[PDB]
Amino acid sequence: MAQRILQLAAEGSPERLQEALQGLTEGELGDMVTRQALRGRETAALLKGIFKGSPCSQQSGVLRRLQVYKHCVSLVESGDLHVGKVSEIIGLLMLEARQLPGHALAELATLFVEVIKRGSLSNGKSLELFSTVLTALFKKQLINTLCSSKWDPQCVIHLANMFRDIPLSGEELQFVVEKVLRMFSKLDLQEIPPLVYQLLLLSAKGSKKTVLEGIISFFNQLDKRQKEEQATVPLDQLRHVEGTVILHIVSAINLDQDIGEELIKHLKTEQQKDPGKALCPFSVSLLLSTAVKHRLQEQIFDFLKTSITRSCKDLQILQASKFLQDLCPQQYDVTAVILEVVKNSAFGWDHVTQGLVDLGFSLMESYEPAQQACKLGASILLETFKVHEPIRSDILEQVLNRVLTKAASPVSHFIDLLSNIVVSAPLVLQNSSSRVTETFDNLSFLPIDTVQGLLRAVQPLLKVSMSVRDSLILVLQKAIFSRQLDARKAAVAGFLLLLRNFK
């Protein structure tokens, strides 16, 4: 039909095109589906061809315009075209689309996915034109019966990635959610990554509550099930799902993570049943791996503190009872939660689980029951030294100079902690002792009792290698010739009153 539009409306204004196609009659849509593999830029050639009839979205093209529409929105809406022509037809369409007739443009276009998407979908390209006609302007009643009312595989990406430009979150957020469960959940590894990312970005309008509560709610239902029935594994794919939903919450955490704090410690820690809400593994894993940043020390430290406090000082005050301790509730142990998280985070949540080593070095000392609190903090620091093997060498160096240069209170907590750490250190420095060989000289000003315990604790490591001892002997001997206070003695005897004294 190459001569057709360009001979009717090719040369002539008032009666050329109207005459040479008053009844060209291929349906409404002869050439563009009479020459599917048409002549290069024929797509817009013929597009302005029909456009010689009347404008875009115009009522006068009851068969001409709207039938160019019916042809393109469906056949090249789902079938095969040129992907580039799959840009071009929609280009020229979107362009003409501004000039529609105020009724004549209302196609099956308020829920008219029920016209096309509900039974005919699978190619995303076509979705944008709905955004175009919509922006042209309610009609979303089909949206009520289907936010994805048959979105089997294609009510997740395609509907969202245009729900950006022309979406409504009142039931569109919720409908995404309800779909997430076993429909949306059908994708394995696509269940929370892609839809989650789109979900948050579309959240950028709002829905702090309803778009917050669900990512973790779904996460925690999945967890409670796949635990009480017995990237990680076929039963560790909780690793991938966690990695996404966290890293997404963390990265976008800028402006509305004040709301995540506000809710996930204003709901659970208000009605108090948070031991089953404000402590689930995948619902605080965020709380303390999206907090190693700068605006997070001041709220996260205080939250976890008051939690450990109220939790322990309740769930003991009914551990001496029967007339109120046996015909009575259950308790979920906040200490057991945090000790769980130390167990679960062995999978790889790196910047989700360096908040721990920081939690240890900055609770298990400075925390001050109160003695129970410090006793707890021993657990976080020690266990974190226990499980995840690459990230503790800096833990030990935080400790040594946290507790080998201070006032007299630093004997007990940190001294016992260094004792237990090095003592649990199965040669943890047993080839890594280079912070020490310049720690050791600092000691000639410590108190009376501290110099002993420093000697004793390091006394495990002294058994290893003469690079420890051949430098100890010197950095002490020098003390004896000069002032040489009890420290030279505590040391002379300690080396002597030891097997190191032999040979």
């Binding site: 830029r41 071009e88 280009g91 020229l92 175009t132 430009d165 800028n254």
Partner: protein, 705 residues
Amino acid sequence: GCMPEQLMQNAFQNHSMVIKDFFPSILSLAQTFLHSAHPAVVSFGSCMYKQAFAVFDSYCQQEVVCALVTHVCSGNETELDISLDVLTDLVILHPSLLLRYATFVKTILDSMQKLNPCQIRKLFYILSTLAFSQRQEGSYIQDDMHMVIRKWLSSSVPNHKQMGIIGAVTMMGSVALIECDGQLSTLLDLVGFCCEQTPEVLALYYDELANLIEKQKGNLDLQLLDKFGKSLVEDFPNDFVVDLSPTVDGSFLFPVKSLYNLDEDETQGAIAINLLPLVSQKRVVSPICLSPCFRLLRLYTGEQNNGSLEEIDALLGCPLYLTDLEVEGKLDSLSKQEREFLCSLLFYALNWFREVVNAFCQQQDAEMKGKVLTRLQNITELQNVLGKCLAATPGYVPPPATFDSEAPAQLQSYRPYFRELDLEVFSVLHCGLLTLGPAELCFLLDDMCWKLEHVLTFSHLCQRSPKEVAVCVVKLLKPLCNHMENMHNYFQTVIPNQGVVDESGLNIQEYQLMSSCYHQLLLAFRLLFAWSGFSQHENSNLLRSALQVLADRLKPGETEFLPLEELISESFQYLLNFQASIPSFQCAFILTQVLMAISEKPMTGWKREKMASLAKQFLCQSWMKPGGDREKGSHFNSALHTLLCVYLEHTDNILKAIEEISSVGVPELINSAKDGCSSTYPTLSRQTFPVFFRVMMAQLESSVK
């Protein structure tokens, strides 16, 4: 003043190993001292971030690009510009490394809720420079770029429609140097339909065609350049300005002769008066097609030519078809058709001519030289008629000119709608003496000065470099201002007595603003020869390479003359002219400041004492001021404070002369007469004696207390 950026730049050169463990420090501070409001700190921190990119490990390399993009998404204003600057620097500084953070670079692309046209051009520039690198990531950048394209193109939001074209051209030119030929063709016809019913979007396509053309030198390529230009091949001669045959009547009120008609070109042609013939009555008034589009076609004539000379010859004086506009009162008793018609006609005519010269300036053929003279003459004359119409457009003469097409009767009512004067064609160092005709120095110099102080210390103006501004000023300043000042000071000094003969026709005709032109020229000398940024490794040697031609009368000496007395002596020899006839006290404060900037570096024997000579001469300059409103009493005592404080600036605070100077207030209330407690001359006045004696009491009793 301590802690120079030279230091920290050195620090990176000597503190690799000692620095490497700084990692929390450099980073965590830099964003606290690289978004703070004092220009040294911001320039420092920018040196920080860029240097940080110079020196780090992998996680460091990433931490940088992340801190940037985090600034880019949400930010403040100066942080905005600094973010983009830091970016464009990083990305055009070393390309082949800065790509690893690419997809992280892209994550701003679908959150960047912030653009001006400027930053929009910037971000497009970053994305273009990235996009032409990869294959499939450049695909998805094409996806977001077609995506932002099509979504723009359909946008009815006012900013969105132009923003589309600005980035459309932006990404195209980024194209300008797989299936990129085809995708870009899809965009090509896409933009084509997208504008082919929009005129202003036309002007977008053209003008934005220009800047990408000119700011390349060997990257714009002819086989590549042929595409977007061919529909811009004949399009100017095809429709722009209707032909000139002596019978072409029709719809018009004003008889379209060759009125105002140059005819400085040849004596046979059909490049007629195209204005009335193809614009005004033409279709609906064409805002930029007649002028900006001529700019684009002359731009293709320049760059698209690469040496084009006759393509504008064929109407090189084809004079516009506006009838002779001498009846401005012959427009009185009517309005709003001939009024606004004349207003848009005058705007268009000033456009046609100012472009005819702006593209006609730097062309160095002889007949081009004479035509440029005739053009400046017609420009001044039509400017006189246009000022008469500016009074005749008291109330409504809006900017129908090309308002840059990129956004979304008085002295300054015509600041916007004027076109943009050139960047190499403000220089003709041979406009000889008139009394270069009469107004030509004033015009070319006002166009020098109205922004020459902006750069020193409009978008095509600032797109050049102020360092390049100094470079060109040094390369071309002395050869014009030398002959100008040398003739003009003594001319105003000896013609003034001829003004005493009733020679006001010589006074308000020979140099009625010849003094004003002198005062401009002196202000230009002061602004240029003292660059504020001379205090560095560059502008000091600059000020010296300017002094090495400052030497007006006699030589500078040998291959080097390090003692500045050749400079101060060229300065005294210069002041020898206008120590005879300075045109007024308004020029008085100017001669003072221009001495004080560069001639007033050392304050010692014959110079600080010369400061005594200057302050005592400024007091000695006998007063010349008629009496009206109190306008000159706003700076004529602020300047007086500098003058008396300059006679006491070369010296100390004058607790000796200040006694009779306050006694000068005792004659200063003598009558309507200047400082006259035995003086009777300027340095005092009717109202200026009160504030002036008050400041003299300040300069004495703020120290002597």
